[PDB]
Design a protein around this ligand. Structure first.
Ligand code: MG
Ligand code: MG
Lengths: 371, 376
């Protein structure tokens, strides 16, 4: 299954909803107490996701026994006020007595929105920030962008993403409130990959520390390999454990710990979201690399020069009749990169029944050092 | 996983290959003994499928013990001559001493190409008929079109399909040969659905006989439900048995039986391919129909009027707070005292129940399904 479903994510600052207003797109109108229901109606959006901060517990006198029971109380009460039965993402946020780190909101939305994209078979995403307050809008937008980027690359599909906002404040039903398309982008597997790597490669040298042993070095290295089309490396240098550990890290509930005067909320720093997106995209490349798979990777996941270099190397390999035993490419015909990841002294080739494979074999440590 | 892989299917009449020529697309050239290798190079196509007839068995002195062994001899010997290691579809065909029914070639290509599409995560398909002979081109093109139609609708994705043919060289030795895009189409889930139903609904009254009990009526009836957006009916009237039995029928090898100077080949009549496509598409609609699922079905699998009527009825339903006990739509929406299926886009008020469970509102025909079925 593949899927062409649409979804709208909406940042809602007040789970009680808002004064009824008449929203409008292209002259067509829909009256609502929340912009997201108007976007859903006017754009015929399949799925709805309301994003709330844990801080709105205060509105309903929800208890702080633990994050899960607190968020369940929020959802039960908001469903009745908003007339939206599902789905809800209730994220760690900083607001009044609720204390923490704003980037934790980002991490949480990235991870939870990614899971939703997987489940829903999505090809079009709307992000409605009409009712967001403080930093909700900027961080939900960027966290969802990251999730759609990871999703498009791993699922190998195109996903359209649009940012919407309106201004219903101090208006009523006699007011017409336009829902504006602010920006619309198309994310392809290539541009999803490039966004994910971009978010690793523009961070300071210590940014990815304490994620796993030597993560401070391993993470930017894996990102550089992904960014430059080193598919054989992504296939052969196992990162499945890193991915599993990050899933474990992000799957656990935030901690809610009440003070005298405060509720402290602890989730995971942004570096965990960026790292997960990286290893999630890398998981696309698992398994042995035969020539047609590599041709496809070149077309799908490499920029134009890198694609051309890889395809030229493959063209050269396809001129020869290939045997069962493994030989270095040299035996048939900056160096790592000038040959698009197939340097002749550092890559083997072999034929196993109907496929020719390229592998670094026991030379992978040499390759790793040149990344 | 979804996928944006490309694939070319090539009808090849002679597994020995052809006079080498320089194929060209848009000024760019590639010399080959087979058009499909030039297409693969010039259009950077991920996957290659060579379609051969079983009749090429004699080229390599292949034995006729059974279809599997004959096909495997053909494939192993063709690989070296053609320079293509995989994949091969070796189909029943009629030619010279090989006798049978030409539509069996269609059925075989449909089913086997469909399996290949599923495995390969495809969004772009090329059909190269350059080296096809007799009816290979017409039947491969139409069989593949049906396959992609079924695949697009069931997987819910768009697929582009293009028919290519080189300049025919005839009995001459040309030097440069253009590879022409003849036809290029885009198949959406809706376009796939409509092509599948079209192939059912343009057949004679008895065309679908002997597939399963009362299939002459049941098949057209399912196609009519699908063609007209009766998604609740498709969700509630079983067709998984029909799908399973068709997949079992089609997965069995063709029968090859040599006689005095003839080899008779038997596969399955075209009706099995068309019926398989139908039930494969219908299998998309499994599960209870909650209103968001229905809205999605209207947006994805229904023509403009049907989409509008369904969405209108859903808009009305969504005004109400829904209880957990099943009630007819009319119990919510119609007064006591006086005041049909298609005018309500499949949600007639006296024949459809509604209820809410675990955050979703559902519509179902429940015990009224027979009455709905009478009206299809
Ligand atoms: Mg949540
Ligand atoms: Mg075959």
């Amino acid at each position: 299954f593949q899927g062409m479903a649409s979804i709208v994510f909406s940042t809602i600052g007040n789970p009680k909803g808002y004064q009824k207003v008449t929203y409008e797109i292209d002259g067509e109108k829909f009256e609502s107490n929340v912009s997201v229901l108007a976007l859903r109606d006017l754009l015929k959006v399949d799925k709805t996701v309301v994003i709330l901060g844990i801080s709105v517990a205060d509105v309903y006198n929800c208890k702080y026994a633990d994050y899960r029971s607190c968020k369940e109380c929020i959802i039960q009460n908001s469903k009745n006020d908003l007339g939206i039965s599902e789905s809800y993402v209730v994220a760690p946020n900083v607001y009044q007595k609720f204390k923490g780190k704003p980037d934790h909101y980002f991490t949480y939305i990235y991870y939870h929105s990614l899971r939703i994209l997987e489940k829903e078979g999505i090809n079009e995403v709307f992000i409605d920030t009409t009712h967001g307050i403080n930093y909700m809008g900027v961080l939900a937008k960027e966290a969802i962008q990251l999730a759609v980027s990871a999703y498009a690359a791993k699922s190998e599909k195109e996903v359209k993403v649009s940012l919407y906002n309106s201004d219903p404040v101090g208006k009523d039903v006699s007011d017409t409130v336009k829902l504006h398309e602010i920006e619309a982008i198309k994310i392809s597997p290539l541009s999803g990959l490039k966004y994910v790597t971009y978010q690793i490669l523009n961070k300071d040298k210590n940014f990815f520390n304490k994620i796993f042993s030597d993560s401070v070095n391993a993470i930017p290295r894996f990102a550089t390999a992904l960014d430059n089309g080193l598919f054989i490396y992504l296939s052969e240098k196992d990162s499945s454990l890193h991915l599993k550990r990050l899933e474990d890290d992000l799957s656990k509930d935030p901690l809610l710990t009440p003070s005298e005067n405060e509720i402290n909320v602890v989730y995971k720093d942004m570096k965990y979201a960026l790292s997960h997106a990286l290893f999630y995209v890398i998981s696309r490349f698992s398994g042995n690399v035969d020539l047609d798979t590599l041709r496809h990777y070149a077309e799908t996941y490499a920029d134009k020069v890198t694609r051309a270099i890889i395809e030229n190397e493959v063209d050269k390999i396809e001129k020869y009749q290939m045997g069962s035993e493994r030989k270095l490419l040299g035996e048939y015909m900056r160096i790592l990169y000038a040959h698009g990841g197939l340097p002749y002294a550092g890559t083997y080739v072999y034929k196993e029944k109907d496929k020719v494979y390229v592998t670094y074999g026991d030379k992978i440590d040499e390759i790793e050092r040149q990344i």
